[PDB]
Swiss-Prot record, chain B:
Name of the featured protein: Mannose-binding protein C
An annotated GO BP: innate immune response
Tagged with keyword Transferase: no
Subunit structure and binding partners: Oligomeric complex of 3 or more homotrimers. Interacts with MASP1 and MASP2. Interacts with MEP1A and MEP1B and may inhibit their catalytic activity.
Disulphide-bonded residues: C20-C109, C87-C101
Known role: Calcium-dependent lectin involved in innate immune defense. Binds mannose, fucose and N-acetylglucosamine on different microorganisms and activates the lectin complement pathway. Binds to late apoptotic cells, as well as to apoptotic blebs and to necrotic cells, but not to early apoptotic cells, facilitating their uptake by macrophages.
UniProt GO cellular component terms: collagen trimer; extracellular space; multivesicular body; protein-containing complex; serine-type endopeptidase complex
Gene Ontology molecular-function annotations: calcium ion binding; calcium-dependent protein binding; D-mannose binding; galactose binding; identical protein binding; phosphatidylinositol-4-phosphate binding; protease binding; signaling receptor binding
Source domain of life: Eukaryota
Length: 115, 112
């Protein structure tokens, strides 16, 4: 927890569409760090690489949260985002806390955020 | 402290357990009136609590097998109607009712 936000991690891996459904089921959303403190809190609850609620699906290289709000704070791993291969429009938080853009169809743990 | 969150969909207890455990929580088990009211605050309709008498009839335990102390049964409950009611839901007035574990209700998950 950070301020009014609570972060919980999943135990199993799944693609972002399913991750979204899971957090939405309990009326939360996929975790979106707004500052370094929240980034650390999310990293701490995630025991492995996990999805964040950030994507550039609507407009390439324009990252926004799942409610359409452009993100301000970012913590990209060196070399990212790189939209490699056929494209990478979702975002995961690596085990060192930095971010990587990855295919939304790939599976990772999910960290959900509740307020 | 404990944090309570309600589901949007209705499901039987086994699925409710699976949902809460997916985010490393458990089905809400109020230990006093304050927590019972906190669960009421988040549940918009009848919802499962993490309590059952599946082991021994009329002996209620939380999902980890710990016998509960605080209870808030609705008048006339628990009545174990018909083929049996071994699960528990929080009614919209905050009182509890024992119901079939196979019936579907909203679920309130608990995290600490
Ligand atoms: O070299 C880093 C590169 O490795 C893989 O290709 C994927 O994880 C990419 O998302 C990442 O950018
Ligand atoms: O009359 C109360 C009775 O109504 C139905 O039969 C069920 O909801 C029971 O669990 C409950 O005890
Ligand atoms: Ca992209
Ligand atoms: Ca990448
Ligand atoms: Ca019973
Ligand atoms: Ca009953
Ligand atoms: Cl993608």
């Amino acid at each position: 927890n950070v301020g009014k936000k609570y972060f919980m991690s999943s135990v199993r891996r799944m693609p972002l569409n399913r991750a979204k459904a899971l957090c939405s089921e309990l009326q939360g959303t996929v975790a979106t760090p707004r500052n370094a403190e929240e980034n650390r809190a999310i990293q701490n609850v995630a025991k492995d690489v996990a999805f964040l609620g950030i994507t550039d699906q609507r407009t390439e290289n324009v990252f926004e949260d799942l409610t359409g709000n452009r993100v301000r704070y970012t913590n990209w791993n060196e070399g990212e985002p790189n939209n490699v291969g056929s494209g990478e429009n979702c975002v995961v938080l690596l085990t060192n806390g930095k971010w990587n853009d990855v295919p939304c169809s790939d599976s990772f743990l999910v960290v959900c955020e509740f307020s």
